Paper text:
HuR/ELAVL1 is an RNA-binding protein involved in differentiation and stress response that acts primarily by stabilizing messenger RNA (mRNA) targets. HuR specifically recognizes adenine and uridine-rich elements (ARE) and uridine-rich sequences in 3′ untranslated regions (3′UTRs) of mRNAs. Hu/ELAV proteins share a common protein architecture with two consecutive RRMs, separated from the third RRM (RRM3) by a less conserved, flexible hinge region of variable length. Here, we report crystal structures of HuR RRM3 free and bound to U- and AU-rich RNAs.
To overcome this limitation, we produced RRM3 fused to an N-terminal thioredoxin 1 (Trx) tag via a short uncleavable Gly-Ser-Ala-Met linker to improve solubility and suitability for crystallization. As expected, HuR RRM3 adopts a classical RRM fold with a canonical β1-α1-β2-β3-α2-β4 topology. Similar to a subset of RRMs (e.g. PPIE RRM, HuR RRM1) RRM3 has an additional four amino acid β3′ strand between α2 and β4. The β-sheet surface is predominantly positively charged, providing a suitable interface for the binding of RNA. The analysis of free Trx-RRM3 and RNA-bound RRM3 crystal structures suggests several possible dimerization interfaces, three of them involving Trp261. SAXS data recorded for Trx-RRM3 at the lowest tested concentration could be fitted to the crystallographic structure of Trx-RRM3 dimer with χ2 = 1.17. Our crystal structure of RRM3 reveals that the neddylation sites (Lys283, Lys313) are localized and directed away from the main RNA binding and dimerization site.
Numbering used by the authors:
A (entry chain A): 1 to 109, 111 to 191
B (entry chain B): 1 to 20, 22 to 108, 112 to 191
């Protein structure tokens, strides 16, 4: 598809972070089975969602600098951006129907309970948050806030939990948890 | 409480791995929730005599043990059965809650095998891959006894078949770093 932006590490800020409107970024590379599976699907989506979504690709072999800035551990990974901010993430192979469902749910949009985690160490990552909160119930989204300049955790993140009771159980249990050398604060985001 | 065992790195093998159901509590002096739960342990230790042993491992005194079980914080409880991790519970909890946890783990879901993990793979990687697909109940990274490096494989347990299946269909062939993964239902 001629509608898909060919990203580079240098074009990322302009093409994604300053874009208006939703941008779906595909992290991929030539040595990757599921990349090849989803490539035709992304082409059809770029056509079928034109006017509501822009599709962008970043080859991580040629552009090794971006994926680490978003905690991206492998490929294929889809990141949905809105106004310069990650709204949602989808990892690995998927069907066209499944991609549409992801897009449609995240383009509509606020669902789940939001938890605020403060005083994370500079090495904290999405993995840490998944491992803390996942045992308590279904989590739909995790966001680690990273410093623009460093790529390190800026000291806080968020987790989104489907059911209120599970979220309050995680909060009651994880507040005060000492993760490495940092005692954590864990609360409902007001 | 005299019912507690006092673990050291050097006695871990003997007290935990070579012994036969124990609950290990990783803790330290600078830790709020550790103080909150330490009285609940003593109640459990006398209250579970015969059926379970409680032991403690101070992570300052004994800093070897934690990263060999991928423990990143305290407090963390690990339930071993015959030398392997059966279950884990992180953070503060009521007596009620620890009862629930011990009762149900003495005493499951769909078991997923992940193969070709790199040597630095940990439980966080697995939570992060599988968590988005729905309810995960347990993850286990298999480590080498000698290196404490991931041996190349792990397991995840997921409650709901359709979620497990979607995770398998999506994550098989995912390239995590320089390694392509196999993911399958365990047979
Ligand atoms: Na490539
Ligand atoms: Na939940
Ligand atoms: Na997600
Ligand atoms: Na599940």
């Amino acid at each position: 598809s001629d509608k898909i932006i060919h990203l580079t590490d240098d074009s990322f800020d302009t093409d994604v972070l300053k874009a208006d409107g939703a941008i779906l970024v595909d992290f991929w590379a030539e040595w990757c089975g599921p990349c090849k599976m989803i490539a035709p699907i992304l082409d059809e989506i770029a056509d079928e969602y034109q006017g509501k979504l822009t599709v962008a690709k970043l080859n991580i072999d040629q552009n090794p600098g971006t994926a680490p800035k978003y905690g991206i551990r492998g490929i294929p990974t889809l990141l949905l951006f809105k106004n310069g901010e990650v709204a949602a993430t989808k990892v690995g192979a998927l069907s066209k129907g499944q991609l549409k469902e992801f897009l449609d749910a995240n383009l509509a949009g606020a669902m789940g309970w939001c938890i605020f985690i403060y005083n994370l160490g500079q090495d904290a990552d999405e993995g840490i948050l998944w491992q803390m909160f996942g045992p308590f119930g279904a989590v739909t989204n995790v966001k680690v806030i990273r410093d623009f300049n460093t790529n390190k955790c800026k000291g806080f993140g968020f987790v989104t939990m489907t059911n209120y009771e599970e979220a309050a159980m995680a909060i009651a249990s994880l507040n005060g948890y000492r993760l490495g050398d940092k005692i954590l604060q864990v609360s409902f985001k007001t």
